[PDB]
């Protein structure tokens, strides 16, 4: 059986990227984190304090606490037939804002703005629903300067 | 054509006053090879010569052949700058009769020699002290080396501004009326 140390099998997971070692740039510390925000977890090997467990690497969580240089995150973890919302205290260096929620918030803003504009201007309420890409419509293709090229299977050649 | 103007411009640039070669420092070394009274008396010799207290260098390893143990003080050295350096350099070159080999000059423009008896440097022999030999090293370089040594925003000295063996030899010959002996038979 395997040993059960904290950093077993993280040889590449906790390593830095090629030609990306050294001093950690400061935007990491300038980023703003508020409780209720969604963050991706990606361990930074250069910082050994407040490191997330390997199980949480690459997962997204919701912030529930904001301390001086760390955040508490609620991350879903599957244990047998239940998903547990584990709470973990991770430092800022291992955290990154999640764009999935921000995209949705932008879409909500656009929807509200479009609805307000249409109602104010008396236009009919617009369609504010994402729809799956439908099958292509009917069209005409012209062969002018694009004559069809007759293709045939090629014979076998002995490429030594 | 254009080459004439280029060459005259390059020579005019080389005649710049900031390119003047000067003595940066003179390093005096005495590796006594052991600790104790001999090292103390060598330190006294260097103090008498330079006028400033020297510093002791300890062995980096242990060599049974040399009788050296790690962290044992075995050398004393001084660094001299300014007119004092020129005075001591002239005394040493007098001891050598202003004769040097072309193989005494390094690729970076520094040159050194050695004195076997410090009495020859115009130091009165003292029975309590004794006689010691020492290594003389002279570092020549122009103004503007501070850019490579300052703490803030250090740079790299340009190739034209760097010194060469030929320029060092010419400086020696002109300044000290030096003589370049034929190569020591290899």
């Amino acid at each position: 059986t395997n040993s059960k140390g904290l950093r077993r099998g993280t040889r590449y997971m906790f390593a830095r990227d090629f030609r990306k070692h050294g001093v950690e740039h400061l935007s990491t510390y300038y980023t703003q984190y508020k409780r209720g925000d969604l963050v991706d977890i990606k361990t930074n090997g250069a910082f050994q304090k407040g490191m997330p467990f390997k199980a949480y690497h690459g997962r997204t969580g919701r912030i529930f606490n904001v301390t001086r240089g760390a955040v508490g995150i609620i991350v879903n973890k599957r244990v047998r037939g239940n998903i547990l919302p584990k709470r973990i205290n991770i430092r800022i260096e291992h955290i990154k804002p999640s764009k999935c929620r921000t995209d949705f918030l932008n879409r909500v803003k656009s929807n509200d703005e479009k609805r307000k504009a249409a109602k104010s201007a008396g236009q009919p309420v617009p369609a504010l629903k994402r729809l799956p890409v439908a099958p292509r419509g009917a069209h005409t293709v012209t062969t002018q300067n694009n004559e069809p090229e007759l293709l045939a299977p090629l014979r076998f050649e002995i490429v030594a | 054509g254009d080459i004439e103007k280029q060459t005259e411009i390059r020579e005019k640039k080389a005649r710049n006053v900031m390119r003047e070669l000067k003595i940066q420092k003179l390093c005096l070394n005495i590796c006594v090879g052991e600790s104790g009274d001999r090292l103390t008396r060598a330190a006294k010799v260097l103090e008498q010569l330079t006028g400033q207290t020297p510093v002791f260098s300890k062995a980096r390893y242990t060599v049974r052949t040399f009788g050296i143990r790690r962290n044992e003080k075995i050398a004393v050295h001084c660094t001299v700058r300014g007119p004092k350096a020129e005075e001591i350099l002239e005394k040493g070159l007098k001891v050598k009769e202003y004769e040097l080999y072309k193989e005494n000059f390094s690729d970076t423009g520094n040159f050194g020699f050695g004195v076997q008896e410090h009495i020859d440097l115009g130091i009165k022999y003292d029975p309590s002290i004794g006689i010691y030999g020492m290594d003389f090293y002279v570092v020549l370089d122009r103004a503007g080396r501070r850019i490579a040594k300052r703490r803030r925003a250090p740079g790299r000295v340009g190739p034209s501004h760097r010194v060469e063996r030929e320029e060092s030899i010419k400086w020696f010959q002109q300044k000290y009326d030096g003589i370049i002996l034929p190569p020591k038979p290899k």
Partner: protein, 289 residues
């Protein structure tokens, strides 16, 4: 000898951050100087940059953002001619005056100068801006850069100037001039004399007595401006009074038209044409040699 800087060396080489290659920013200290606690969110944390060049003293107030620092106020010792002083724009007195200028200027800008006058009587004693009313004094943390923190250094002279101007700069009197490191005693009189430039006047008198030629060489432009060793202190006091009287930034000028003084990058066609010309020239030289 094996070439160390070969293709593999360059292929595996990783460059440092630009401001580290330039040898201008110490990122270890920068992280601790500019990073705000995450439970304070976007509240700016203000830093007092002090930088002394060969001919000028620069004092700035800034706070960091994810796209670059924001400088909110700045005072340069080359502005002191507006307040008297024309020479000696780098000594202890000039540094202190620059700090005072920055403090008063920014306090006026944010409309706190009336509330916080600062220490208006130069005594050299350690001073901290005590809170008045409800608004606490403006706060900034000192940033010395790559300078050495020695006793009596001019970076702490600028810090002292700001503190006396009335900005809360967390500090202790250990590194001010006149602080004896051995007995841990602070000489406010010595610090005041240094702030007023008495050391410069003493050097002037000493050189005048020693050798007139050396004196002229050392203080050529001081004499040209008419500052001898018996009015320098009064000049510095007048400078302090003028700064405390008016501190608003100087008015900007009009954008003069600009022309190209450097060479413009060659175009792709020009580069190819030069390559062709060089090929032809090299071939001709080969044939004619």
């Amino acid at each position: 000898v094996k070439v160390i800087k070969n293709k593999a060396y360059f292929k595996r080489y990783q460059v440092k951050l630009r401001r580290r290659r330039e040898g201008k920013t110490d990122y270890y200290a920068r992280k601790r100087l500019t990073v705000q606690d995450k439970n304070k969110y976007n509240t700016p944390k203000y830093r007092l940059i002090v930088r002394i060049t060969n001919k000028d003293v620069v004092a700035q107030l800034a706070y960091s953002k994810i796209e670059g620092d924001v400088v909110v106020a700045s005072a340069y010792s080359h502005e002191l001619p507006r307040y008297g002083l024309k020479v000696g724009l780098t000594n202890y007195a000039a540094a202190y005056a620059t700090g005072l200028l920055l403090a008063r200027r920014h306090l006026k800008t944010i409309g706190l100068d009336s509330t916080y006058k600062g220490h208006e009587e130069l005594t050299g004693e350690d001073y901290n801006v005590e809170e008045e009313g409800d608004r606490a004094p403006f706060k900034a943390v000192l940033d010395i850069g790559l300078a050495r923190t020695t006793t009596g250094s001019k970076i702490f002279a600028v810090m002292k100037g700001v503190a006396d101007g009335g900005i809360n700069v967390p500090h202790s009197e250990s590194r001010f001039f006149g602080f004896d490191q051995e007995s841990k005693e602070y000489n406010a009189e010595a610090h005041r004399d240094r702030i007023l430039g008495k050391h410069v006047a003493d050097y002037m008198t000493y050189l005048k007595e020693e050798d007139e030629d050396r004196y002229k060489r050392q203080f050529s432009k001081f004499l040209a401006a008419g500052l001898n060793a018996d009015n320098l202190v009064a000049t510095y006091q007048k400078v302090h009074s003028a700064i405390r009287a008016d501190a608003s930034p100087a008015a900007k000028k009009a954008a003069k038209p600009s022309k190209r003084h450097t060479a413009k990058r060659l175009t792709y066609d020009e580069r190819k044409q030069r390559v062709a010309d060089k090929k032809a020239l090299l071939l001709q030289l080969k044939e004619q040699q």
